[PDB]
Amino acid sequence: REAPKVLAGTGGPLPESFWDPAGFTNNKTDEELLFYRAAELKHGRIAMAAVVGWFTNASGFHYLGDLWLKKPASDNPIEAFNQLSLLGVFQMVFFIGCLEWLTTVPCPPPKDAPWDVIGMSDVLEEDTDENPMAEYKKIQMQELNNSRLAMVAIIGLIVQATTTG
Amino acid sequence: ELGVQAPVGFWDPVDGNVASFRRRRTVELKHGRISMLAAMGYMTPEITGKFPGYLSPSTLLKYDDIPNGLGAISKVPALGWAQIFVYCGYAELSQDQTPGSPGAEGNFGFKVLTSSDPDSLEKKLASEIANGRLAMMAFTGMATQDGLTGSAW
Amino acid sequence: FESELGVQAPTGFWDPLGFAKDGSMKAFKRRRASEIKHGRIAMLATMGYITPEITGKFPGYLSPSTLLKYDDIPNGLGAISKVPALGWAQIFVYCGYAELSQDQTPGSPGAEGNFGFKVLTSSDPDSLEKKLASEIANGRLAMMAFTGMATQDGLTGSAW
Amino acid sequence: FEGELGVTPPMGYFDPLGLSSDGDKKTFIRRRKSELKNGRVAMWACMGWIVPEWYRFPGELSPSSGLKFSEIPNGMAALKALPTEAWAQMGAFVALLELGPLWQDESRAPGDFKTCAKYGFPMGSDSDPVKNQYSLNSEINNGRLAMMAITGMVFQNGITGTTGPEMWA
Amino acid sequence: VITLTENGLFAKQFLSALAFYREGLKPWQRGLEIGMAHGYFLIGPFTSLGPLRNTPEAATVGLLCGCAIVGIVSIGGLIFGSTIKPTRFDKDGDKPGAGFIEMINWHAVGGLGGAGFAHALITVF
Ligand code: CLA
Numbered sequence: 081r082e083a084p085k086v087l088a089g090t091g092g093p094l095p096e097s098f099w100d101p102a103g104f105t106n107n108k109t110d111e112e113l114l115f116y117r118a119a120e121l122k123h124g125r126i127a128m129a130a131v132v133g134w135f136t137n138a139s140g141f142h143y144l145g146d147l148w149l150k151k152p153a154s155d156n157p158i159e160a161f162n163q164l165s166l167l168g169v170f171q172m173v174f175f176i177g178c179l180e181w182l183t184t185v186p187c188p189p190p191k192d193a194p195w196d197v198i199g200m201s202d203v204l205e206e207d208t209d210e211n212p213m214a215e216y217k218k219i220q221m222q223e224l225n226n227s228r229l230a231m232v233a234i235i236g237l238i239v240q241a242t243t244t245g
Numbered sequence: 246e247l248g249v250q251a252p253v254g255f256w257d258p259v260d261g262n263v264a265s266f267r268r269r270r271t272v273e274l275k276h277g278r279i280s281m282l283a284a285m286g287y288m289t290p291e292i293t294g295k296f297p298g299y300l301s302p303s304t305l306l307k308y309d310d311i312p313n314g315l316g317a318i319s320k321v322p323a324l325g326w327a328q329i330f331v332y333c334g335y336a337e338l339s340q341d342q343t344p345g346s347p348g349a350e351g352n353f354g355f356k357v358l359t360s361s362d363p364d365s366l367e368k369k370l371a372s373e374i375a376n377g378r379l380a381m382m383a384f385t386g387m388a389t390q391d392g393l394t395g396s397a398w
Numbered sequence: 399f400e401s402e403l404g405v406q407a408p409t410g411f412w413d414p415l416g417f418a419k420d421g422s423m424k425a426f427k428r429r430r431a432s433e434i435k436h437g438r439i440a441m442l443a444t445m446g447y448i449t450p451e452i453t454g455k456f457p458g459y460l461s462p463s464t465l466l467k468y469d470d471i472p473n474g475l476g477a478i479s480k481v482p483a484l485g486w487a488q489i490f491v492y493c494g495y496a497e498l499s500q501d502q503t504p505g506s507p508g509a510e511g512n513f514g515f516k517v518l519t520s521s522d523p524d525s526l527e528k529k530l531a532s533e534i535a536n537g538r539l540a541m542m543a544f545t546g547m548a549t550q551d552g553l554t555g556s557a558w
Numbered sequence: 559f560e561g562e563l564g565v566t567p568p569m570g571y572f573d574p575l576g577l578s579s580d581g582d583k584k585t586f587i588r589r590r591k592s593e594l595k596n597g598r599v600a601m602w603a604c605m606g607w608i609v610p611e612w613y614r615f616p617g618e619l620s621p622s623s624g625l626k627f628s629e630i631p632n633g634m635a636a637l638k639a640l641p642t643e644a645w646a647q648m649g650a651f652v653a654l655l656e657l658g659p660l661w662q663d664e665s666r667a668p669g670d671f672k673t674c675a676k677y678g679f680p681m682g683s684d685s686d687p688v689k690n691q692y693s694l695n696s697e698i699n700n701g702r703l704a705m706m707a708i709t710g711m712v713f714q715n716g717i718t719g720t721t722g723p724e725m726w727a
Numbered sequence: 728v729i730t731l732t733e734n735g736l737f738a739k740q741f742l743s744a745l746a747f748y749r750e751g752l753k754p755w756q757r758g759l760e761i762g763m764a765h766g767y768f769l770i771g772p773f774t775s776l777g778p779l780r781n782t783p784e785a786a787t788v789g790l791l792c793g794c795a796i797v798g799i800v801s802i803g804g805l806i807f808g809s810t811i812k813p814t815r816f817d818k819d820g821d822k823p824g825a826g827f828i829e830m831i832n833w834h835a836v837g838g839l840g841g842a843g844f845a846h847a848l849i850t851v852f
């Protein structure tokens with residue numbers, strides 16, 4: 081594999097199965113593969129929060145949005161987005177814009193691990209041999225596998241909502 | 246080698262290489278498998294009837310209400326054929342041709358060839374591809390029959 | 399870059415807006431891959447309108463469950479709402495693979511418009527540039543023809 | 559700092575009050591970036607007062623308010639007549655420009671942005687100050703002219719109380 | 728003892744990029760930035776839920792109270808700079824604590840500016 085070894089033992093059904101049934105990674109360089117993972121984790125981390133946000137909003141808990149609209153917004157998260165006051169949406173975009181600015185320009189993640197937006201690499205070990213720790217690779221699997229599931233899950237929610245209610 | 250047959254040679258009046266033939270071989274075997282599944286698959290809603298039944302999504306106790314060779318739909322089993330389409334993709338993305346080192350070898354999960362009866366190479370590999378070619382024409386000819394010449398039988 | 403397949407003859411290195419004063423060497427191939435892909439789609443798109451006009455609509459049923467004789471679907475804009483979303487999904491899926499096939503990633507053989515069709519592979523008789531330049535030039539014509547055709551079908555109302 | 563891109567024959571090296579007598583190369587870089595950016599904002603602002611006095615955009619600013627581009631007053635009265643959500647979204651967009659594309663890199667030229675072209679055309683080029691010394695000076699002087707004008711037009715609206723013929727005698 | 732919230736890469740780069748720590752900032756720039764933040768924020772707690780929260784003005788009162796808070800904390804900073812005299816902002820060969828005093832004065836100016844800007848936004852919009 082050579083370059084895909086930098087993201088090795090971190091995907092597939094079982095943790096050490098480089099899936100890629102399209103050749104999207106072969107012939108690509110090490111930095112490109114790392115950047116591809118940075119896109120994957122960022123999508124998945126947002127997808128995990130997106131699914132959680134979808135469920136806490138599709139059950140009837142839209143306080144900020146019921147207290148701002150002065151009426152219980154519809155449970156359907158897609159329809160509740162329209163009812164949500166335009167001031168709320170613009171502030172929501174701005175807050176994420178500040179976070180995206182903050183991570184990129186002032187506090188950039190490293191170039192070898194472009195997904196360390198919190199930056200554990202300066203205090204983490206990741207290469208020791210203890211059992212009651214050094215399971216960081218396993219928790220990387222749980223983040224990726226859960227996030228990948230959340231990505232297809234949230235799309236299913238949006239596609240079904242926008243079509244078959 | 247492999248699918249070279251007996252009644253004809255390389256039958257290439259048009260690939261004719263190594264790497265390009267390998268990809269074409271994967272297409273050939275793949276199309277062969279589906280036709281054989283489809284050909285025997287089409288004869289079964291015939292004699293032995295539209296065998297199905299049991300509690301299905303919007304098709305509970307559906308006796309395979311998708312009739313005719315095309316299957317039609319109208320929320321009858323053919324909508325459930327999309328589940329066949331989806332799960333067909335799962336096998337097409339897990340046990341696929343990108344890690345399929347030979348032409349169309351899936352590592353023989355069933356191990357039918359581990360002396361259960363099939364054999365490696367020789368006639369069996371040639372018999373699989375030759376039978377696939379016959380079924381592909383048969384399935385296409387069966388498609389013409391349902392369209393403008395009545396039904397299958 | 400001033401010596402690729404795009405410079406035919408009637409116009410030279412036609413970059414009035416200066417995308418090449420800063421166009422990186424890989425950016426050319428990326429934009430060339432965009433141009434080749436755009437042109438090939440336009441040729442297929444154009445055929446897809448002029449051919450159902452002279453040749454009648456498909457003898458068939460399109461959707462075996464929702465009575466689409468291909469005649470209730472007009473040739474032009476508005477057919478997007480007439481063709482089923484699944485027939486739309488299935489063409490989306492088919493085009494989805496055609497790029498999720500052998501990769502067109504930067505630097506890959508799919509990134510310069512090469513995919514493995516080889517319908518017209520002349521035995522290198524100083525014609526590889528001819529077929530390449532013809533495909534690019536026709537794609538440029540097809541894109542311009544389509545946009546006019548799209549405006550023809552829209553501003554008039556239907557077809558041409 | 560004579561020879562820096564901003565010296566013009568009408569004044570040479572102006573500096574009347576002597577605000578940059580000492581080197582303070584950091585101070586000059588900051589003030590030049592302000593001079594260019596304030597000029598560009600003023601230039602876009604100066605066109606923002608002239609054009610509505612001739613032409614108004616066709617559609618509606620806020621379709622779910624009845625509000626159409628025509629009935630919005632011109633000048634420093636649209637701030638209290640254009641809905642607050644409208645103005646907040648311009649602020650959010652200018653925030654994107656200041657933080658994202660139009661982010662002045664330290665190593666780059668004073669006014670150089672890593673996503674904009676030779677006169678600002680979106681989708682860009684790295685600056686070539688020596689070759690473009692004419693237009694770089696032209697931008698500053700036009701920005702310098704615009705800053706005087708936009709300070710005028712706003713002042714004219716503040717006193718006259720409109721944007722019509724009286725505001726610009 | 729290094730922890731994630733103080734010694735991680737993000738935490739270190741966030742603390743270093745604060746106005747109080749950002750490299751290359753003149754002391755008046757740090758003061759101006761901190762003051763703008765404080766003055767803009769401090770208006771809210773008074774103009775809302777204040778003694779005159781329901782009056783027709785209800786915001787000029789908040790503006791005055793926020794400016795008063797900014798002035799009081801600036802006076803406290805001046806006391807700190809004239810008693811402790813931090814010398815981490817002084818340039819070489821200057822009166823000790825001059826950088827801190829300049830930062831505090833420009834914090835007062837920035838607090839006035841931020842309070843006025845918040846009030847202007849509230850009144851206009
Ligand atoms: C934002 C999407 C995204 C991105 C950028 C990545 C990126 C990556 N994945 Mg990944 N993955 C994702 C989503 C994503 N993933 C989801 C949702 C799943 C669940 C099925 C997986 C499951 C998965 C496995 C099981 C494995 C990877 C692996 C990898 C790495 C190898 C590169 C690769 O596979 O192609 C990178 C490029 C892409 C993924 C392109 C995105 C997809 C294109 C645009 C077409 C898809 C369009 C789609 C058909 C239509 C959208 C709707 C759809 C939901 C129906 C790379 C870091 C491998 C790895 O690192 O293991 C060591 C691996 O084994 N992924």
Ligand code: CLA
Binds near residue numbers: 250257261
């Ligand atoms: C998916 C279809 C498919 C594919 C990919 C292949 C691929 C291959 N076949 Mg094969 N074959 C097929 C179907 C297919 N076959 C069928 C159905 C038959 C039965 C008639 C045969 C009979 C056959 C023989 C007897 C031999 C091969 C051989 C080969 C190999 C070399 C031949 C070659 O280069 O052909 C290249 C051909 C093409 C690129 C054209 C593709 C077909 C076009 C698109 C249409 C053909 C006309 C069709 C009937 C009209 C359809 C109408 C429709 C639109 C409605 C290659 C691996 C030879 C071999 O073993 O080599 C080692 C050999 O001797 N094949």
Ligand code: CLA
Binds near residue numbers: 429436
């Ligand atoms: C998707 C469209 C597209 C793209 C990506 C390209 C890309 C390319 N072309 Mg090209 N071309 C196109 C369409 C396109 N072309 C069309 C339609 C024509 C026919 C007029 C041509 C004619 C042409 C010639 C004659 C030559 C090129 C060349 C080139 C290459 C270098 C020039 C360059 O950077 O162009 C970049 C192109 C773009 C960035 C496209 C931007 C288009 C703008 C945004 C809009 C233009 C107006 C548009 C028609 C408005 C439509 C109205 C609508 C809104 C209603 C590059 C690979 C040259 C070459 O190969 O050099 C080696 C060369 O000699 N092209």
Ligand SMILES: CC1=C(/C=C/C(C)=C/C=C/C(C)=C/C=C/C=C(C)/C=C/C=C(C)/C=C/C2=C(C)CCCC2(C)C)C(C)(C)CCC1
Binds near residue numbers: 765767837839840843
């Ligand atoms: C809640 C939240 C949070 C927090 C946040 C924050 C903390 C915010 C803040 C904010 C702020 C705090 C803001 C501020 C701003 C400010 C401003 C914006 C200002 C401005 C100013 C100005 C502009 C001024 C000017 C001037 C001067 C300088 C002087 C003279 C006068 C004048 C006026 C000209 C977190 C993340 C934790 C999480 C969750 C969410």
